[PDB]
């Protein structure tokens, strides 16, 4: 259905790392102006690397969304270093706040709530704060703690007058995404959601990131998505999830868009998006 597919693909977003600025310039011509492009907060980059990438996103006509990784920050002064530097070069209106992967925080922020609820985002004029969602749960956090954190972060942003959205962990199956969308809307969370999708990539790369991010690969999912090490193709794209979601999304799911992780490369990911949309007639 072209209508349901166009709604899902409306205002789709991208993630880049600070190492991807040249690839972004090579892909920019394929990217709709104003596209939201997030910037990871992971080891191997300094603040100026991250700010440079955010500034390039804006200059190319897109909207940067810097990630803030709470457990990777020492103190408020450390976080302000990054926010000050961002604010001087970009229209700092959108951030995405996560706890961060280390099992031990480096500083005063134990999780995304600690950062969000400190007030620092309002002080810098942030209007939109994204938070995480895990349709398949999390290897180190209970479903209960995941749900309470979502509630508490939403309540904190509501208290502060800052809009929120959710971007989900990528997955290889539409069923847990559809069931989790029901659960969170049943729990009162009605804000916009972006379903994370792994871009087209080699099966080895997909299994690698999936293992490193704790994303499940059951036997039935390996068969349906096409993630066998015996594959004759050797690569896989997210069309099986998209084609399973598109007929089944309805009004009760609220606003539901897509977020692509370009694990196979940014140019390759955007080519796939353009070609997929063309094949489907949207
Ligand atoms: C879209 C998306 C983007 C991401 N981007 C980044 C990124 O740029 N950089 C990065 O470092 N990580 C990133 N992550 C990963 C994220 O940091 C980890 O999944 C982390 O383990 C959980 O973060 P969270 O914000 O979901 O946790 P929160 O919602 O802040 O925490 C949920 C609950 O679990 C508790 N908790 C938090 N961490 C742990 C832990 N390790 N063990 C036990 N309890 C815990 C919290 O106190 C809270 O009670 C991203 C994840 C997603 C889905
Ligand atoms: C930030 N990402 C992330 C995640 N999940 C976890 N556990 N950690 C992450 O860093 N899911 C969403 C997103 C996927 N993108 C990436 C990008 C780079 C790298 C990396 O470590 N090089 C990992 C994941």
């Amino acid at each position: 259905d072209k209508a349901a597919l166009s709604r899902l693909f409306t205002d789709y977003s991208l993630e880049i790392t600070p190492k991807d600025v040249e690839a972004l310039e090579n892909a920019a011509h394929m990217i709709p102006p104003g596209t939201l492009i997030s910037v990871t907060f992971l080891p191997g980059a300094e603040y100026e690397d991250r700010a440079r990438a955010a500034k390039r996103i804006q200059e190319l006509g897109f909207r940067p969304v810097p990630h803030l990784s709470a457990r990777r920050l020492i103190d408020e002064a450390d976080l302000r270093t990054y926010l000050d530097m961002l604010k001087g070069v970009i229209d700092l209106k959108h951030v995405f706040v996560i706890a961060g992967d280390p099992n031990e925080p480096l500083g005063i922020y134990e999780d995304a709530l600690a950062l969000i609820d400190s007030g620092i985002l309002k002080e810098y004029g942030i209007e939109h704060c994204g938070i995480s969602g895990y349709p398949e749960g999390h290897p180190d956090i209970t479903d209960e703690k995941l749900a309470k954190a979502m509630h508490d972060k939403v309540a904190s942003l509501k208290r502060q007058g800052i809009d929120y959205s959710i971007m989900t962990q990528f997955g290889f199956d539409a069923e847990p995404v559809l069931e989790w969308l029901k659960q969170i809307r049943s729990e009162g969370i009605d804000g916009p959601v972006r379903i994370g999708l792994a871009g087209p990539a080699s099966i080895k790369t997909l299994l690698r990131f999936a293992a490193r991010c704790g994303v499940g690969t059951s036997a039935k999912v390996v068969k349906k998505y096409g993630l066998s090490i015996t594959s004759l193709i050797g690569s896989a794209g997210p069309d099986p999830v998209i084609e399973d979601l598109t007929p089944v999304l309805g009004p009760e799911h609220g606003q539901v868009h897509l977020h692509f992780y370009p694990f196979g490369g940014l140019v390759k990911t955007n080519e796939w998006i353009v070609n997929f949309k063309g094949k489907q007639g949207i």
Side-chain angles (χ1 to χ4, degrees), residues 15 39-42 67 69 71-72 96-102 110-113 132-134 138 140-141 145-146 149-150 153 167-169 259 261:
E15 178 193 277
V39 178
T40 59
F41 187 146
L42 285 169
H67 297 190
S69 182
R71 286 178 169 214
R72 295 180 191 288
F96 188 79
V97 183
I98 57 266
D101 287 309
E110 83 178 313
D111 58 20
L113 176 67
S132 60
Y134 303 86
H138 194 286
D140 315 316
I141 309 170
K145 288 270 289 213
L146 284 184
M150 173 157 323
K153 293 184 289 191
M167 326 207 261
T168 70
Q169 182 65 287
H259 184 60
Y261 305 103

Coordinates of all heavy atoms in Angstrom, one line a residue, residues 15 39-42 67 69 71-72 96-103 110-113 132-134 138 140-141 145-146 149-150 153 167-169 259 261, ligand 1, unseen atoms left out:
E15 N 21.5 8.0 11.1 CA 22.6 8.1 12.1 C 24.0 8.1 11.4 O 24.2 7.3 10.5 CB 22.6 7.0 13.1 CG 23.7 7.0 14.2 CD 23.8 5.7 15.0 OE1 23.0 5.5 15.9 OE2 24.6 4.8 14.6
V39 N 24.2 12.1 15.5 CA 25.7 11.9 15.6 C 26.0 11.1 16.9 O 25.6 11.6 18.0 CB 26.4 13.3 15.7 CG1 27.9 13.1 15.9 CG2 26.0 14.2 14.5
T40 N 26.6 10.0 16.7 CA 26.9 9.1 17.9 C 27.8 9.8 18.9 O 28.5 10.8 18.6 CB 27.6 7.8 17.4 OG1 28.8 8.2 16.8 CG2 26.7 7.0 16.5
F41 N 27.7 9.3 20.1 CA 28.6 9.7 21.2 C 29.2 8.4 21.8 O 28.7 7.8 22.7 CB 27.8 10.5 22.3 CG 28.6 11.1 23.4 CD1 28.3 12.4 23.9 CD2 29.8 10.5 23.9 CE1 29.0 13.0 24.9 CE2 30.5 11.1 24.9 CZ 30.2 12.4 25.4
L42 N 30.3 8.0 21.1 CA 31.0 6.7 21.3 C 32.5 7.0 21.4 O 32.9 8.0 20.9 CB 30.6 5.7 20.2 CG 29.2 5.1 20.3 CD1 28.8 4.4 19.0 CD2 29.1 4.2 21.6
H67 N 23.9 12.9 19.9 CA 23.7 12.1 21.0 C 24.5 12.6 22.2 O 25.6 13.1 22.0 CB 24.1 10.6 20.8 CG 23.3 9.9 19.7 ND1 23.5 8.6 19.4 CD2 22.5 10.4 18.7 CE1 22.7 8.2 18.4 NE2 22.1 9.3 18.0
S69 N 25.7 10.8 25.7 CA 25.8 9.6 26.4 C 26.2 9.8 27.9 O 27.3 10.1 28.2 CB 26.9 8.7 25.7 OG 27.0 7.4 26.4
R71 N 26.6 8.2 30.8 CA 27.6 7.5 31.6 C 29.0 7.8 31.1 O 30.0 7.4 31.8 CB 27.4 6.0 31.5 CG 26.2 5.6 32.4 CD 26.0 4.1 32.3 NE 25.0 3.6 33.3 CZ 25.0 2.5 33.9 NH1 26.0 1.6 33.7 NH2 24.1 2.2 34.8
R72 N 29.2 8.4 29.9 CA 30.5 8.7 29.4 C 31.0 10.2 29.8 O 32.0 10.6 29.3 CB 30.5 8.6 27.9 CG 30.3 7.1 27.4 CD 30.3 7.1 25.8 NE 29.9 5.8 25.3 CZ 30.6 4.7 25.4 NH1 31.8 4.6 25.9 NH2 30.0 3.5 24.9
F96 N 19.6 13.7 21.5 CA 19.1 12.3 21.8 C 20.0 11.9 23.0 O 21.2 11.9 22.9 CB 19.3 11.4 20.6 CG 18.8 10.0 20.7 CD1 17.4 9.9 20.6 CD2 19.5 9.0 21.1 CE1 16.8 8.6 20.8 CE2 19.0 7.7 21.3 CZ 17.6 7.5 21.1
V97 N 19.3 11.5 24.1 CA 20.0 11.3 25.3 C 19.9 9.8 25.7 O 18.8 9.2 25.8 CB 19.5 12.1 26.5 CG1 20.3 11.9 27.8 CG2 19.6 13.6 26.1
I98 N 21.1 9.1 25.9 CA 21.1 7.7 26.3 C 22.0 7.6 27.6 O 22.8 8.5 27.9 CB 21.6 6.8 25.2 CG1 23.0 7.2 24.8 CG2 20.6 6.7 24.1 CD1 23.0 8.1 23.5
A99 N 21.8 6.5 28.3 CA 22.7 6.2 29.4 C 24.1 5.9 28.9 O 25.1 6.4 29.6 CB 22.1 4.9 30.1
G100 N 24.3 5.3 27.8 CA 25.6 4.9 27.3 C 25.9 3.5 27.7 O 25.5 3.0 28.8
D101 N 26.7 2.8 26.9 CA 27.0 1.4 27.1 C 27.9 1.0 28.2 O 27.8 -0.2 28.7 CB 27.7 0.8 25.8 CG 26.7 0.6 24.6 OD1 25.6 0.0 24.8 OD2 27.0 1.1 23.5
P102 N 28.8 1.8 28.8 CA 29.7 1.3 29.9 C 28.9 0.8 31.0 O 27.8 1.4 31.4 CB 30.5 2.5 30.3 CG 30.4 3.5 29.2 CD 29.1 3.2 28.5
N103 N 29.3 -0.3 31.6 CA 28.6 -0.9 32.8 C 28.8 -0.1 34.0 O 28.1 -0.4 35.0 CB 29.0 -2.4 33.0
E110 N 24.2 8.7 36.1 CA 24.1 7.2 36.0 C 23.3 6.7 34.8 O 23.5 5.5 34.5 CB 23.6 6.6 37.3 CG 22.0 6.6 37.4 CD 21.5 6.0 38.7 OE1 22.0 4.9 39.1 OE2 20.6 6.6 39.3
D111 N 22.5 7.5 34.3 CA 21.6 7.1 33.2 C 21.1 8.4 32.5 O 21.4 9.5 32.9 CB 20.5 6.2 33.7 CG 19.6 6.8 34.8 OD1 19.6 8.0 35.0 OD2 19.0 6.0 35.5
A112 N 20.2 8.1 31.5 CA 19.7 9.3 30.7 C 18.9 10.2 31.5 O 18.9 11.4 31.4 CB 19.0 8.7 29.5
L113 N 18.1 9.6 32.4 CA 17.2 10.4 33.3 C 18.0 11.4 34.1 O 17.6 12.5 34.3 CB 16.4 9.5 34.2 CG 15.6 10.2 35.3 CD1 14.4 11.0 34.6 CD2 15.0 9.2 36.3
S132 N 15.5 6.3 24.1 CA 15.6 5.0 23.6 C 14.3 4.2 23.7 O 13.4 4.5 24.5 CB 16.7 4.2 24.2 OG 16.4 4.1 25.6
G133 N 14.2 3.2 22.9 CA 13.1 2.2 23.1 C 13.7 0.8 22.7 O 14.5 0.7 21.7
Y134 N 13.3 -0.3 23.4 CA 13.8 -1.6 23.1 C 12.6 -2.6 22.9 O 12.2 -3.2 23.9 CB 14.7 -2.1 24.2 CG 15.9 -1.2 24.4 CD1 15.8 -0.1 25.3 CD2 17.1 -1.3 23.7 CE1 16.8 0.8 25.5 CE2 18.2 -0.4 23.9 CZ 18.0 0.6 24.8 OH 19.1 1.5 25.0
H138 N 16.4 -5.7 26.7 CA 17.8 -5.3 26.8 C 18.5 -6.4 27.6 O 18.0 -6.9 28.6 CB 17.9 -3.9 27.6 CG 19.2 -3.3 27.5 ND1 20.3 -3.7 28.2 CD2 19.6 -2.1 26.8 CE1 21.3 -2.9 27.9 NE2 20.9 -1.9 27.1
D140 N 21.0 -6.2 29.7 CA 21.4 -5.9 31.0 C 20.4 -5.2 31.9 O 20.7 -5.0 33.1 CB 22.7 -5.0 30.9 CG 23.7 -5.5 29.9 OD1 24.0 -6.7 29.9 OD2 24.2 -4.6 29.2
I141 N 19.2 -4.9 31.4 CA 18.2 -4.1 32.1 C 16.9 -4.9 32.0 O 16.5 -5.3 30.9 CB 18.1 -2.7 31.5 CG1 19.4 -2.0 31.4 CG2 17.1 -1.9 32.3 CD1 19.4 -0.7 30.6
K145 N 12.5 -2.1 34.5 CA 13.4 -1.0 34.6 C 13.3 -0.2 33.3 O 13.3 1.1 33.4 CB 14.8 -1.4 35.0 CG 14.9 -1.8 36.4 CD 15.2 -0.7 37.4 CE 16.6 -0.3 37.2 NZ 17.3 0.2 38.5
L146 N 13.3 -0.9 32.2 CA 13.2 -0.2 30.9 C 11.9 0.7 30.9 O 11.9 1.8 30.4 CB 13.2 -1.2 29.8 CG 14.6 -1.8 29.4 CD1 14.5 -2.7 28.2 CD2 15.7 -0.7 29.2
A149 N 12.1 3.7 33.3 CA 12.9 4.7 32.8 C 12.2 5.5 31.7 O 12.3 6.8 31.6 CB 14.2 4.2 32.2
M150 N 11.5 4.8 30.8 CA 10.8 5.5 29.7 C 9.7 6.5 30.3 O 9.6 7.7 29.9 CB 10.1 4.5 28.8 CG 9.1 5.2 27.8 SD 8.8 4.3 26.3 CE 10.3 3.5 25.9
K153 N 11.6 9.5 32.1 CA 12.2 10.5 31.2 C 11.1 11.3 30.6 O 11.2 12.5 30.4 CB 13.0 9.7 30.2 CG 14.3 9.1 30.8 CD 15.2 8.5 29.7 CE 14.6 7.2 29.1 NZ 15.5 6.4 28.3
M167 N 13.4 6.7 19.6 CA 14.0 5.9 18.5 C 14.4 4.5 19.1 O 15.1 4.4 20.1 CB 15.2 6.6 17.9 CG 15.2 8.1 17.8 SD 16.2 8.5 16.4 CE 17.8 8.9 17.2
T168 N 13.9 3.5 18.4 CA 14.1 2.1 18.9 C 15.4 1.5 18.4 O 16.0 1.9 17.4 CB 13.0 1.2 18.5 OG1 13.0 0.9 17.1 CG2 11.6 1.8 18.8
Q169 N 15.9 0.6 19.3 CA 17.0 -0.3 18.9 C 16.6 -1.0 17.5 O 15.5 -1.3 17.3 CB 17.3 -1.3 20.0 CG 18.4 -2.3 19.7 CD 19.7 -1.6 19.7 OE1 20.0 -0.9 18.7 NE2 20.5 -1.7 20.8
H259 N 14.1 5.1 11.3 CA 15.5 5.6 11.5 C 16.5 4.6 11.0 O 16.4 3.4 11.4 CB 15.7 5.8 13.0 CG 17.0 6.4 13.4 ND1 17.4 7.7 12.9 CD2 18.0 6.0 14.2 CE1 18.6 7.9 13.4 NE2 19.0 6.9 14.2
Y261 N 20.2 2.9 10.5 CA 21.6 2.8 10.9 C 22.4 2.3 9.7 O 22.3 1.2 9.2 CB 21.7 1.8 12.1 CG 20.9 2.2 13.2 CD1 19.7 1.5 13.5 CD2 21.2 3.2 14.1 CE1 18.9 1.8 14.6 CE2 20.4 3.5 15.2 CZ 19.2 2.8 15.4 OH 18.4 3.1 16.5
Ligands
LIG1 C1 18.8 4.6 19.1 C2 20.0 4.3 20.1 C3 21.1 5.1 20.0 C4 22.2 4.8 20.9 N1 23.3 5.6 20.8 C5 24.3 5.4 21.7 C6 25.4 6.3 21.6 O1 25.6 7.2 20.8 N2 26.4 6.0 22.6 C7 26.3 5.0 23.5 O2 27.3 4.9 24.3 N3 25.2 4.2 23.5 C8 24.3 4.4 22.7 N4 23.1 3.6 22.7 C9 23.1 2.4 23.7 C10 22.6 2.7 25.0 O3 23.6 3.6 25.6 C11 22.7 1.4 25.8 O4 21.7 0.5 25.2 C12 22.5 1.5 27.3 O5 22.9 0.2 27.9 C13 21.1 1.8 27.7 O6 20.8 3.2 27.5 P1 19.4 3.8 27.7 O7 19.3 5.3 27.5 O8 18.4 2.9 26.9 O9 19.2 3.6 29.3 P2 18.3 4.4 30.3 O10 16.9 4.5 29.8 O11 19.0 5.6 30.8 O12 18.3 3.3 31.6 C14 17.2 2.4 31.8 C15 17.2 1.9 33.2 O13 18.4 1.0 33.3 C16 19.3 1.5 34.2 N5 20.6 1.2 33.5 C17 21.3 2.0 32.6 N6 22.4 1.4 32.1 C18 22.4 0.2 32.8 C19 23.3 -0.9 32.8 N7 24.4 -0.9 32.0 N8 23.1 -2.0 33.6 C20 22.0 -2.0 34.3 N9 21.0 -1.0 34.5 C21 21.3 0.0 33.7 C22 19.0 2.9 34.4 O14 19.4 3.4 35.6 C23 17.5 2.9 34.3 O15 16.9 2.4 35.5 C24 22.1 3.8 21.8 C25 20.9 3.0 21.9 C26 19.8 3.3 21.0 C27 18.6 2.5 21.1

